[PDB]
């Protein structure tokens, strides 16, 4: 009966659809992400932290300090042998 008008009804359409929820998720997801590996805190020491940073990161990740811990029990219990028997 007249010139009907759905070319411009986008302004209040852009809430209900599914990429709108993904869009408002990931524009929030992107800003607080640190850019290029920044603030990783690669240097730390608390009298036991260099042990962790040298041994217990994902780079080395070897169980040989447990060996040393086992050696520590060889340092401990055998000396407890010297304290008991």
């Amino acid at each position: 009966v007249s010139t009907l008008i759905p070319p411009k009804v986008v302004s209040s359409k852009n809430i209900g659809s599914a990429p709108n929820a993904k869009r408002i998720a990931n524009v929030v997801h992107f800003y607080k992400s640190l850019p290029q590996g920044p603030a990783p805190a690669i240097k730390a020491n608390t009298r036991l932290a260099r042990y962790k940073a040298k041994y217990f990161d994902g780079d080395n990740a070897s169980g040989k300090p447990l060996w040393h811990f086992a050696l520590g029990i060889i340092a401990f219990g055998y000396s407890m042998e010297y304290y008991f028997h």
């Binding site: 009966v1 007249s2 009907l4 008008i5 759905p6 009804v9 986008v10 209040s12 359409k13 209900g16 659809s17």
Partner: protein, 89 residues
């Protein structure tokens, strides 16, 4: 040529009482005047329609309007249904 002349003078004259001088028509028993110039003077309008076709009806155009000049309760429903069609688009 009295053949030619008298034939042509009777040929002119015996209908000359039918056309030149309005003396009806001596040999015809029905008259000639109340047929074509009186009865069927309305002939083509007895062959067509009188008082609408031949008077020709200079008729005013029946004025149609716009959509009743109400652009609120229908345009906002158009915009809501256009939200609906864009959810279908």
């Amino acid at each position: 040529q009295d053949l030619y002349l008298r034939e042509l003078k009777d040929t002119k004259l015996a209908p000359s009482t039918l056309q030149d001088a309005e003396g009806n028509v001596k040999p015809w028993n029905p008259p000639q005047k109340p047929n074509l110039p009186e009865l069927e003077l309305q002939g083509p309008e007895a062959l067509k329609a009188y008082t609408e076709q031949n008077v020709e009806t200079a008729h005013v155009a029946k004025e149609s309007e716009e959509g009743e000049s109400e652009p609120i309760e229908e345009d906002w429903l158009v915009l809501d249904d256009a939200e609906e069609t864009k959810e279908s688009h």
